[PDB]
Design a protein around this ligand. Structure first.
Ligand SMILES: *[C@@H]1O[C@H](CO[C@@H]2O[C@@H](C)[C@@H](O)[C@@H](O)[C@@H]2O)[C@@H](O[C@@H]2O[C@H](CO)[C@@H](O[C@@H]3O[C@H](CO[C@H]4O[C@H](CO)[C@@H](O)[C@H](O)[C@@H]4O)[C@@H](O)[C@H](O[C@H]4O[C@H](CO)[C@@H](O)[C@H](O)[C@@H]4O)[C@@H]3O)[C@H](O)[C@H]2NC(C)=O)[C@H](O)[C@H]1NC(C)=O
Ligand SMILES: CCCCCCCC/C=C\CCCCCCCC(=O)OC[C@H](COP(=O)(O)OCC[N+](C)(C)C)OC(=O)CCCCCCC/C=C\CCCCCCCC
Ligand SMILES: CCCCCCCC/C=C\CCCCCCCC(=O)OC[C@H](COP(=O)(O)OCC[N+](C)(C)C)OC(=O)CCCCCCC/C=C\CCCCCCCC
Ligand SMILES: CCCCCCCC/C=C\CCCCCCCC(=O)OC[C@H](COP(=O)(O)OCC[N+](C)(C)C)OC(=O)CCCCCCC/C=C\CCCCCCCC
Ligand SMILES: CCCCCCCC/C=C\CCCCCCCC(=O)OC[C@H](COP(=O)(O)OCC[N+](C)(C)C)OC(=O)CCCCCCC/C=C\CCCCCCCC
Ligand SMILES: CCCCCCCC/C=C\CCCCCCCC(=O)OC[C@H](COP(=O)(O)OCC[N+](C)(C)C)OC(=O)CCCCCCC/C=C\CCCCCCCC
Ligand SMILES: CCCCCCCC/C=C\CCCCCCCC(=O)OC[C@H](COP(=O)(O)OCC[N+](C)(C)C)OC(=O)CCCCCCC/C=C\CCCCCCCC
Ligand SMILES: CCCCCCCC/C=C\CCCCCCCC(=O)OC[C@H](COP(=O)(O)OCC[N+](C)(C)C)OC(=O)CCCCCCC/C=C\CCCCCCCC
Ligand SMILES: CCCCCCCC/C=C\CCCCCCCC(=O)OC[C@H](COP(=O)(O)OCC[N+](C)(C)C)OC(=O)CCCCCCC/C=C\CCCCCCCC
Ligand SMILES: *[C@@H]1O[C@H](CO)[C@@H](O[C@@H]2O[C@H](CO)[C@@H](O)[C@H](O)[C@H]2NC(C)=O)[C@H](O)[C@H]1NC(C)=O
Ligand SMILES: CC(C)CCC[C@@H](C)[C@H]1CC[C@H]2[C@@H]3CC=C4C[C@@H](O)CC[C@]4(C)[C@H]3CC[C@]12C
Ligand SMILES: CC(C)CCC[C@@H](C)[C@H]1CC[C@H]2[C@@H]3CC=C4C[C@@H](O)CC[C@]4(C)[C@H]3CC[C@]12C
Ligand SMILES: CC(C)CCC[C@@H](C)[C@H]1CC[C@H]2[C@@H]3CC=C4C[C@@H](O)CC[C@]4(C)[C@H]3CC[C@]12C
Ligand SMILES: [Mg+2]
Ligand SMILES: [Mg+2]
Ligand SMILES: [Mg+2]
Lengths: 294, 40, 993
């Protein structure tokens, strides 16, 4: 058994068959699998011929945009010691990775960058989603706009003396026009002052009623000095039609933060085509657990 | 179209679920019919 | 419980004297034992009652069903799942609970299967308990010189016991004085007729001598006395029952097939795991992760539903059998009949009816045959001549037996008749085609009768003649044909009378040898009209002197009789032989009768010949002929006792029609073992206790239900509640049909394996998002798939199953490499490709093109990256991309169902085409419809994306698996075509299961 079914010397068989058999089976499987591969490839090519290169056919799983930030928190918590420098390195490294893309050296010349209104403005339509006109042009976004959180002055961005920053960002969606709430009698409390129609407002607060008192002065930095996103940076025409495109950013400094205590801060954007979800905690709003333990 | 192109981001999943259920129900019935057709 | 001392043939102290017997056990031949001494012995060794069986608690046989070979594999699978969960819990934070769900599910599957199988075996046990009708019995013992009737449990060794015709022999007695006592030794020794018990000794074999009464036997006619020699379990049938209980059980063929099946499943499972373990270690992953990968691939290669599918499959075939009165105690004993290739049968009670019946009759120089079948379904014998009427008067009058009071309800053949078996057979035949004998008897008053004499060798009697025109006297007499022939001089031919010239005397001699050679017992009947002038109506013929003319009588005709076989016995034997099943007769009866019954039922085909037959046809000694020219052989038990192992092997290896006669139960067991030593499956069919050791050691025992003994009924595996022998043919047919169906269902549940594993393999090697989730694999293996696999059992035959030769056990298996090459190699591969196709389509329509999916799992899984760029530049949050992955799982599962449609259709038939067999199986159609309705329900019902994580699909996706399904159908169709046109070719020895 054990030895024979492995190698017999009368019938000159190996594992069961002769030399000419293993070849018949191997050749059959090679031809069979080859045909299988060619068929699968053909059915995938017709699929490539069914889709368009300038627009995703289905855009419903990304209708309400998200709200992400610059620091990379493992559990949406920012905890670091003001003494030990090797504590906030993971934060600054990320922050830097994000801002390193808005360098002026990158944004230069007429192409493909264009100087836009230094003050919030309206939408700008660079035509349809075609290849007729060449690569569209995107508005320039300077670093310096963000005043105390730019890594140009205090590389660390704040984390050095108990005053961290948080660069918020709106998720890029093709053909998405941000729309703000109108001036009518129904509008949140916060939003009444400084109603620049052209600005999408971002406002942070405390999750619990108690924490209000322990959170100090939320100082926002942005285009024009407002706490929002200028409507002029939209819409986004997609990578293929707008490579070298920069999305607006909003900096948030959490000055006067109580020491040695976990603070739950929820930031939220307001607008018509913006809706939140009780399941996705990053759809329109975001949560951060800051704790400057020193 | 233009600014108010809100329809480009909506899908009527409700009507789809309703129809898919009607169909599932029908297939289930037909099945039962075939199964008991002969024992009567 | 020494088995070798129980395997030995019975020994005894029969060859002794009445003085030696009384001197060995201690006992007064005329006064018996004393009550004080009787109680001293009763308490000294134990009551005369067999030991009850070894009770089996119900919790024990439940734990048995929870184990085995398949349930054990599922048990180890659950254990592995929990091990991997423990490792993930102690090594990583936020451990997914996928493994804990899969483990509790596997445990539940094993528990449910056990509950169902146990419930079935209990059902059979209850209907089995409704047959033991044990009524207490009391014996007649003589103590201190007085007769007393005491419970059977109080008889001891040494006291005197008296028996009377109609009672049961309590213990093993040593007859001391008898008065024409006869006993029925059919259950223990297998002797169809009543052997007379005489105080004298006659044969060296205790079973053949007449000075010993046995346990469980009954005294038919007469009274006798005897000293109890053996008592309690130490009796003959006690040692036989104890031996039966002390025998092993065995292991059916279906079980061995399931075992080798698990062997292959584990071979490929541990192979894929240890290999992808070394491969993962070669690509950078850590050990902690590789261990989980190994366990995951091993668990993924285990069929959770094949267990439930196989059990329900076998149960469905067991109810078809229960509908025709064939009950199986176990569940796998339903397949052993189909795999049998050598049936060892019993004669008395199994091959025959154990009831004497009038077979042939002689009259008007012509042999007439009578119907000897239970339900009376045959040919009449021409009841239009006067000769027959005179014969009916002779037999109906010169006969003293009468039906037992209160039988007005049972049929004419199954009623109780008080008397000898010959007068009973004659009474039944006359009452059958001549109406009520009670009026036939009161119509002619019996005047004087001279009982059968040992010297006269005849039974005669005179009665009045009911002719209202003839007041003469009628004289009738019956007896041995030779004696009666020497007392006649006339012959009633067609009514008139004629002389007894040598022409008819020779025709009578040839008729005598014709009925005699048929293994039947013949009797002669004659009558005469006494002249009323020499013997008036007033003269009384006292039985003292010659008042009747012994000679010058009128012979009317001979009447033979023998025990006939059951109705469907010849047809069933022929059907078994047609299927290539070797029929070997094994019985403890006289060879002169065994050979005749063998030739009459088909065991010894007409034309074949034995060595003695050749020596008789040539007129030469038997030591000269060559034994190779004889196809059939009659092996005597006495000769069987002195034979080596090789000799028995040669007996079965050179003789095709074998008949073992005068074989003891132990020898029966030896014969069964001699058949197994070679390598064939054996089925023993019997009824008495002598068959208990044969039914137990055989691969499958078949006990009779009405005519069977309680011991052989409890030691058998299959019971024939209707005593129909055709059920054996039905069983051998069903055993095959459900086998080809098990093969089809196994290939079905194994084809889905591949499109269920491949996703994870490409997940680790290619780093693409997870294609098939865990709750989907579960919704496939334990949901939709169950109904179709169960339906595959209802498939009819393709070719004649009762025509092909029995399957070879050493070469044709249940799960070979030809199946694995199809399910795991060709169909499963196409199904996996179809699933991946629907997958890529769903991700390409939402924005993730195939070029950007390779290399994303690290960020696609990360829970803190709320900005994942797709092929078009859009930013997707974590929950948004997860919703799409889940919708891809839902469509993958639906693709599986779509390809399963064509798989269930190509699995319906193994060789034949669909346009030939046909879609007449309503269950399969229902399976497809339900399989589709369930998938639509799981996707479209609200709250599923919350509970099970299955999102609705867009009507254009459901059509991504259709081309693959049609291709599967066309490929298998052309496959099942070259096999038909090219028999024995490459496609057959490579893809023919
Ligand atoms: C986008 O801008 C980044 C900053 O640009 C600077 O400021 C702008 C406004 C302009 O003025 C521009 O001209 C400036 O360079 C730019 O990143 C910068 O790249 C340089 C070149 O590698 C870095 O200089 C090196 O500094 C290290 C030590 O760095 C310390 O501080 C940083 C934080 O700033 C920490 O992350 C580090 O861990 C250290 O703690 C020096 O050791 C190193 O030495 C090298 O040069 C000297 C001569 O000076 C040689 O003798 C040595 O052998 C070495 O070769 C450099 O001096 C600079 O740190 C870095 N800035 C930051 C903030 O990281 C970025 O690359 C630009 N990206 C794009 C895509 O344009
Ligand atoms: C022998 C075995 C017989 C078995 C019979 C089984 C019975 C089949 C039972 C039902 C099937 C019919 C289903 C019809 C449903 C139509 C409902 C409908 O209104 O659906 C519209 C969708 C278009 O969706 P949308 O995304 O464009 O819009 C979405 C717009 N929103 C989401 C915004 C609202 O369309 C769809 O679902 C398309 C529906 C699919 C079209 C049916 C294709 C039939 C395929 C082969 C059969 C060919 C037979 C040939 C005859 C031979 C005779 C000898
Ligand atoms: C012998 C003869 C036998 C014959 C038997 C016939 C049986 C009857 C046959 C059919 C009955 C059809 C019933 C149709 C029910 C429609 C319900 C429906 O359309 O609900 C849709 C909405 C949910 O939409 P949404 O906005 O949350 O979508 C998610 C949107 N997002 C995720 C993007 C945010 O419902 C809601 O809100 C409220 C839902 C309330 C709960 C309704 C319960 C329905 C569940 C099961 C019934 C279906 C069984 C059919 C038979 C199948 C057999 C296998
Ligand atoms: C990310 C990528 C995805 C990867 C997915 C992988 C999915 C895995 C799919 C299938 C698993 C394949 C594993 C091997 C299966 C072999 C089946 C087997 O072991 O069944 C057992 C049979 C016994 O059968 P029986 O009972 O009838 O025997 C009766 C003998 N009596 C009667 C004479 C005594 O034993 C035999 O067949 C003898 C054993 C023969 C073993 C052959 C080994 C071939 C394996 C690999 C070859 C690769 C070479 C590639 C290079 C080609 C050159 C270019
Ligand atoms: C592009 C899409 C790709 C899809 C690929 C997957 C396809 C798989 C699904 C269906 C395949 C259907 C194949 C059609 C085969 C028809 C064969 C046929 O017709 O052979 C005729 C037979 C032979 O008769 P004979 O001469 O032996 O009679 C003798 C009578 N004596 C004895 C009285 C003389 O006649 C008979 O079988 C008796 C009559 C039986 C009539 C059956 C009709 C039902 C057929 C299919 C059910 C539909 C399932 C749909 C599943 C989807 C669920 C949503
Ligand atoms: C011959 C014999 C024929 C017999 C045929 C029997 C067929 C039976 C047919 C239908 C009955 C099915 C069960 C009905 C379930 C109703 C559930 C329901 O009406 O849910 C409505 C609400 C959804 O509300 P919402 O939209 O505001 O939620 C928003 C949530 N946000 C916003 C956080 C995402 O539910 C919730 O909230 C919580 C959801 C609770 C989940 C319950 C689902 C059960 C899960 C598995 C069992 C299925 C096993 C398959 C059995 C197959 C049998 C053939
Ligand atoms: C004859 C034909 C039969 C056809 C039937 C199909 C057979 C099905 C076979 C296998 C499927 C069973 C697998 C059980 C899956 C349980 C999943 C589970 O436990 O998930 C736990 C989830 C937690 O999720 P999370 O961490 O995301 O929550 C985060 C919540 N935050 C973030 C808001 C805090 O909790 C929840 O979903 C809460 C809701 C609990 C839902 C329980 C549903 C149980 C469904 C089936 C069990 C009964 C089946 C018996 C039928 C057998 C048929 C032979
Ligand atoms: C994209 C392309 C679509 C094409 C659609 C084409 C539809 C064609 C419609 C019907 C097909 C014609 C009907 C065939 C009737 C044949 C009747 C017959 O007498 O047959 C006998 C022969 C077998 O002879 P033998 O010598 O081996 O017997 C040996 C017997 N012994 C072993 C005892 C010696 O049978 C054979 O050749 C059967 C071999 C036939 C293999 C062709 C399979 C065609 C594929 C699909 C059919 C469509 C069904 C599904 C519908 C999908 C709807 C979307
Ligand atoms: C999306 C999924 C797509 C899947 C599509 C799969 C299509 C691929 C189908 C077949 C390709 C395999 C062809 C292999 C040919 C080389 C095999 C070979 O070297 O074979 C040698 C033998 C000749 O040796 P011998 O027997 O004389 O020696 C006797 C030796 N001793 C004793 C061992 C028997 O060859 C023979 O016997 C002749 C046997 C030839 C095999 C015929 C199998 C045909 C099966 C399917 C074709 C139908 C495709 C329908 C698709 C419709 C799409 C819409
Ligand atoms: C920042 O928070 C501090 C408290 O931590 C505020 O200063 C306190 O003011 C109270 C009077 O209301 C004094 O009793 C405390 O002694 C002060 N503490 C310190 C450390 O100065 C301060 O006003 C806050 N400043 C802003 C801009 O919010
Ligand atoms: C019936 C079977 C055997 C036919 C299989 C045909 C195979 C070989 C055909 C079908 C579709 C074909 C592909 C169709 C499109 C392209 C894109 C082009 O830029 C390179 C060639 C390539 C990649 C083709 C290679 C060959 C291909 C895969
Ligand atoms: C015997 C063969 C040829 C029959 C094939 C029937 C196929 C085409 C049927 C079976 C089930 C059907 C699907 C059942 C449910 C739905 C959901 C509904 O909202 C749109 C139609 C859709 C998606 C159906 C399309 C057609 C479909 C896939
Ligand atoms: C994902 C890809 C690369 C895996 C390809 C696996 C192929 C090569 C494997 C899958 C199933 C395998 C077959 C499974 C069963 C048998 C039967 C045996 O008697 C000879 C080997 C043979 C014929 C195997 C050859 C190799 C085989 C065809
Ligand atoms: Mg018997
Ligand atoms: Mg047994
Ligand atoms: Mg599985």
């Amino acid at each position: 058994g054990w030895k024979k079914f492995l190698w017999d010397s009368e019938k000159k068989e190996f594992l069961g068959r002769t030399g000419s058999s293993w070849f018949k089976i191997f050749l059959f499987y090679l031809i069979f699998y080859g045909c299988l591969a060619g068929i699968f490839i053909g059915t995938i090519q017709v699929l490539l011929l069914t889709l368009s290169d300038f627009e995703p056919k289905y855009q419903d799983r990304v209708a309400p945009p998200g709200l992400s930030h610059a620091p990379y928190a493992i559990k949406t918590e920012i905890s670091f010691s003001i003494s030990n420098p090797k504590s906030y390195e993971s934060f600054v490294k990320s922050m830097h990775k994000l801002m390193d893309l808005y360098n002026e050296s990158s944004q230069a010349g007429n192409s493909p960058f264009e100087d836009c209104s230094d003050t919030p403005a309206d939408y700008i339509k660079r035509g349809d989603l075609d290849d007729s006109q060449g690569q569209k042009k995107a508005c320039r976004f300077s670093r310096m706009w963000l005043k105390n959180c730019s890594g140009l002055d205090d590389t660390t961005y704040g984390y050095a003396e108990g005053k961290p920053c948080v660069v918020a960002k709106l998720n890029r969606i093709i053909g998405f026009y941000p729309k703000p709430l109108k001036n009518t009698t129904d509008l949140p409390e916060e939003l009444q002052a400084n109603y620049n129609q052209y600005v999408l407002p971002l406002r942070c607060a405390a999750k619990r009623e108690e924490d209000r008192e322990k959170i100090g002065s939320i100082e926002y930095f942005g285009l024009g000095g407002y706490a929002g996103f200028p409507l002029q940076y939209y819409p986004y025409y997609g990578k293929r039609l707008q490579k070298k495109y920069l999305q607006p950013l909003l900096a948030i400094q959490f000055t006067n933060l109580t020491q040695n205590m976990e603070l739950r801060i929820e930031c939220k954007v307001y607008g018509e085509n913006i809706d939140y979800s009780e399941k996705d905690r990053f759809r329109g709003r975001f949560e951060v657990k800051i704790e400057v333990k020193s | 179209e233009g600014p108010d192109n809100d329809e480009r981001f909506t899908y009527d999943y409700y009507r789809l679920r309703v129809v898919g259920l009607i169909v599932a129900a029908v297939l289930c019935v037909i099945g039962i019919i075939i199964l008991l057709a002969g024992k009567c | 419980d020494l088995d070798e001392l129980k395997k030995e043939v019975s020994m005894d102290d029969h060859k002794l004297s009445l003085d030696e017997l009384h001197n060995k056990y201690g006992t007064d031949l005329t006064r018996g034992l004393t009550n004080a001494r009787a109680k001293e012995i009763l308490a000294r060794d134990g009551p005369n009652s067999l030991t009850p069986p070894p009770t089996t608690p119900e919790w024990i046989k439940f734990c048995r069903q929870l184990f085995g070979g398949f349930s054990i594999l599922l048990w180890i699978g659950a254990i592995l799942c929990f091990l991997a969960y423990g490792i993930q819990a102690a090594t990583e934070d936020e451990p997914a609970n996928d493994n804990l769900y899969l483990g509790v599910v596997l445990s539940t599957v094993v528990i449910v299967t056990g509950c169902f199988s146990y419930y079935q075996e209990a059902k059979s046990s209850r209907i089995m308990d409704s047959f033991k009708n044990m009524v207490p019995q009391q014996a007649l013992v003589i103590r201190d010189g007085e007769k007393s009737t005491i419970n059977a449990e109080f008889v001891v060794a040494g006291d005197l016991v008296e028996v009377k015709g109609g009672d049961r022999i309590p213990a093993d007695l040593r007859i001391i004085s008898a008065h024409g006592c006869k006993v029925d030794n059919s259950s223990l020794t297998g002797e169809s007729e009543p052997q007379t018990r005489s105080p004298e000794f006659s044969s060296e074999n205790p079973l053949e001598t007449r000075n010993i009464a046995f346990f469980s036997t009954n005294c038919v006619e007469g009274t006798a006395r005897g000293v109890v020699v053996y008592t309690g379990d130490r009796t003959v049938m006690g040692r036989i029952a104890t031996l039966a209980s002390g025998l092993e059980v065995g292991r059916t063929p279906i079980a061995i097939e399931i075992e080798h099946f698990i062997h292959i499943i584990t071979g490929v499972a541990v192979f894929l795991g240890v290999s992808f373990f070394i491969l993962s270690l070669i690509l950078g992953y850590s050990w902690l992760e590789a261990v989980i990968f190994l366990i995951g691939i091993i668990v993924a290669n285990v069929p959770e539903g094949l267990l439930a599918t196989v059990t329900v499959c076998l149960t469905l075939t067991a109810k078809r059998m229960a509908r025709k009165n064939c009950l199986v105690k176990n569940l796998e004993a339903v397949e052993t009949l189909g795999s049998t290739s050598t049936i060892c049968s019993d004669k008395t009670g199994t091959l025959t009816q154990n009831r004497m019946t009038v077979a042939h009759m002689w009259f008007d120089n012509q042999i007439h045959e009578a119907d000897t079948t239970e339900n009376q379904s045959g040919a009449a014998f021409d009841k239009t001549s006067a000769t027959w009427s005179a014969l009916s008067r002779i037999a109906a009058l010169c006969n003293r037996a009468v039906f037992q009071a209160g039988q007005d309800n049972v049929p004419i053949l199954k009623r109780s008749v008080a008397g000898d078996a010959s007068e009973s057979a004659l009474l039944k035949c006359i009452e059958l085609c001549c109406g009520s004998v009670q009026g036939m008897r009161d119509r002619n008053p019996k005047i004087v009768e001279i009982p059968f004499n040992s010297t006269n060798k005849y039974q005669l009697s005179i009665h009045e003649n009911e002719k209202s025109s003839e007041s003469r006297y009628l004289l009738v007499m019956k007896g041995a044909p030779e004696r009666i022939l020497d007392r006649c001089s006339t012959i009633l031919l067609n009514g008139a009378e004629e002389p007894l010239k040598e022409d008819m005397k020779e025709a009578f001699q040839n008729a005598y040898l014709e009925l005699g050679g048929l293994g039947e017992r013949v009797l002669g009947f004659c009558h005469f009209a006494l002249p009323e002038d020499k013997y008036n109506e007033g003269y009384p013929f006292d039985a003292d002197e010659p008042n009747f003319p012994t000679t010058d009588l009128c012979f009317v005709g001979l009447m033979a009789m023998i025990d006939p076989p059951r109705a469907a016995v010849p047809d069933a034997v022929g059907k078994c032989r047609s299927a290539g099943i070797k029929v070997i007769m094994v019985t403890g009866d006289h060879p002169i009768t065994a050979k005749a019954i063998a030739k009459g039922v088909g065991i010894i085909s007409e034309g074949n010949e034995t060595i003695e037959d050749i020596a008789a046809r040539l007129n030469i000694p038997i030591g000269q002929v060559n034994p190779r020219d004889a196809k059939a052989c009659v092996v005597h038990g006495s000769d069987l006792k002195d034979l080596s192992t090789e000799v028995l092997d040669d007996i079965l290896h050179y003789h095709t029609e074998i008949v073992f006669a005068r074989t003891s139960p132990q020898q029966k067991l030896i014969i069964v073992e001699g058949c197994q030593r070679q390598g064939a499956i054996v089925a023993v069919t019997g009824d008495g206790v002598n068959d208990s050791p044969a039914l137990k050691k055989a691969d499958i025992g078949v006990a009779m239900g009405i005519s069977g003994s309680d011991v052989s009924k409890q030691a058998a595996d299959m019971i024939l509640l209707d005593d129909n022998f055709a059920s054996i043919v039905t069983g051998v047919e069903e055993g095959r049909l459900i086998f080809d169906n098990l093969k089809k269902s196994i290939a079905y549940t194994l084809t889905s394996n591949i499109p269920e594993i491949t996703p994870f393999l490409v997940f680790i090697i290619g780093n693409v998002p997870l294609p098939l989730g865990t709750v989907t694999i579960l919704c496939i293996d334990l949901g939709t798939d169950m109904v179709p696999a169960i339906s595959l059992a209802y498939e009819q035959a393709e070719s004649d199953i009762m025509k092909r030769q029995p399957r070879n056990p050493k070469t044709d298996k249940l799960v070979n490499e030809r199946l694995i090459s199809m399910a795991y190699g060709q169909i499963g591969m196409i199904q996996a490709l179809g699933g991946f196709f629907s997958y890529f389509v769903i991700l390409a329509e939402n924005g993730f093109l195939p070029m950007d999916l390779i290399g994303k799992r690290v960020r696609w899984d990360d829970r803190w990256i709320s900005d994942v760029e797709d092929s078009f530049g859009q930013q997707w949050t974590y929950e948004q991309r997860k919703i799409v992955e889940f919708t891809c799982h839902t469509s993958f599962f639906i693709s599986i169902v779509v390809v399963q449609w064509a798989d269930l259709i190509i699995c319906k038939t193994r060789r034949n085409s669909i346009f030939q067999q046909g879609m007449k199986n309503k269950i399969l159609i229902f399976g497809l419809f339900e399989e589709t309705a369930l998938a639509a329900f799981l996707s479209y019902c609200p709250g599923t994306d919350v509970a099970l994580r299955m999102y609705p699909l867009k009507p254009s996706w459901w059509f991504c698996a259709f081309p693959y399904s049609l291709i599967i159908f066309l490929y298998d169709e052309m496959r099942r075509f070259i096999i038909r046109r090219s028999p024995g070719g490459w496609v057959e020895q490579e893809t023919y299961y």
